[PDB]
């Protein structure tokens, strides 16, 4: 804790680095997180990647093939998007040192909260037009990430942040169970970018309950939660998207349930933005709304531009994954700083 913050100033002072380590934000394995300032007055997150305690003797991150592989992906994410609704890389650095004494630092803008801080704030009202807005911005941010070929897979209220300005950006999509699209829950390897608009859905459904749409606490539970609201899915459709494990779990699984009236559900939602819910919310991925009709459907219509489709979006994502030695990464570690800046 004190020792992360204090290694940080000694490192970002021997570099001459435009920041100013103010306090201690989080620390775990693989690295630590200071918030900062840098040479603006722009607040700042500094993570530093130095060394673990991986099966149990201390090995150093960016000297192992495996973890500097895992680092190397995370930080090729992050530096792949330059759009507003997607956290990006503010700085990145590397410090090699020969005896495995490699360091990175990633600088990310500290935004002011989360949108899961947001919706537990009994004191914020969160008004049908603020439920639009974020939404659309959720929804853009979703869709340049699908545009690469990258799916987030974890969406969920804590990863979408709000900047001063209430800016939405989505964050964690290069690393709870009540976000999880049916067919994660049933373990399918298949699963698709359509995994994120079931998250997105329950995020929406959220922002008007103010409480999580789907709180289950097991693979039944949750599952019943889900069709309690959905209606039975068809058995042929259940098979096509579960793994072998989750369909023996279901083989004996009696079920015939009507859907539920969406405005019981969704109380505060008009017919406009029901409809948009129920549309993300389809069990069956195969009929579940892609994000280009959910930003064109008439919920966004005070909001929407086609430009918002096409501007600032990103190449398909690709990373070779036969690398293995971890001099070839360390230069495409010199290679991602290069082209950063």
Not at 236 to 246: H, I, K, L, Q, T
Not at 282 to 309: C, G, K, M, V, W
Not at 316 to 341: C, G, P
């Amino acid at each position: 804790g004190e020792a992360a913050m204090r290694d940080l100033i000694a490192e970002l002072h021997a570099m001459q680095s435009p920041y100013t380590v103010q306090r201690f934000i989080s620390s775990g394995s693989y690295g630590a997180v200071c918030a900062g300032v840098d040479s603006e007055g722009i607040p700042v997150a500094i993570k530093r990647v130095f060394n673990t305690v991986s099966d149990g003797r201390t090995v150093n991150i960016l000297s192992d093939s495996f973890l500097c592989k895992r680092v190397l992906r995370e930080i090729r994410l992050l530096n792949h998007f330059h759009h507003p609704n997607i956290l990006g890389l503010r700085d990145i650095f590397v410090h090699f040192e020969e005896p495995a004494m490699h360091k990175l630092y990633l600088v990310t803008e500290l935004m002011r909260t989360d949108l899961a801080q947001v919706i537990h704030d009994q004191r914020i009202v969160i008004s049908p037009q603020h439920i639009q807005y974020f939404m659309y911005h959720i929804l853009l941010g979703l869709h340049v990430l699908h545009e690469a070929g990258v799916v987030h897979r974890d969406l969920h209220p804590g990863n979408i942040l709000l900047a001063d300005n209430n800016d939405i950006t989505i964050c964690d999509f290069n690393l709870h169970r009540w976000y999880r699209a049916p067919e994660l829950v049933m373990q399918f390897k298949g699963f698709t970018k359509l995994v994120d608009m079931w998250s997105a859905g329950c995020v929406m459904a959220e922002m008007f309950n103010r409480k999580a749409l789907f709180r289950g606490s097991t693979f039944y539970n949750q599952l019943n939660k889900i069709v309690e609201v959905v209606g039975t899915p068809k058995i042929e459709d259940v098979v096509m998207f579960s793994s072998p494990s989750a369909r023996d779990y279901l083989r004996n699984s009696l079920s015939n349930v009507p859907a539920r009236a969406w405005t019981a559900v969704v109380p505060t939602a008009d017919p406009v933005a029901l409809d948009l819910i129920a549309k993300m919310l389809e069990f069956n991925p195969q009929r579940r709304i892609s994000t280009e009709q959910a930003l064109r459907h008439p919920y966004f219509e005070s909001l929407f531009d086609p430009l918002d489709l096409t501007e600032g979006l990103s190449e398909r994502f690709h990373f070779d994954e036969s690398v293995t030695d971890v001099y070839d990464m360390h230069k495409i570690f010199t290679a991602e700083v290069e082209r950063f800046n």
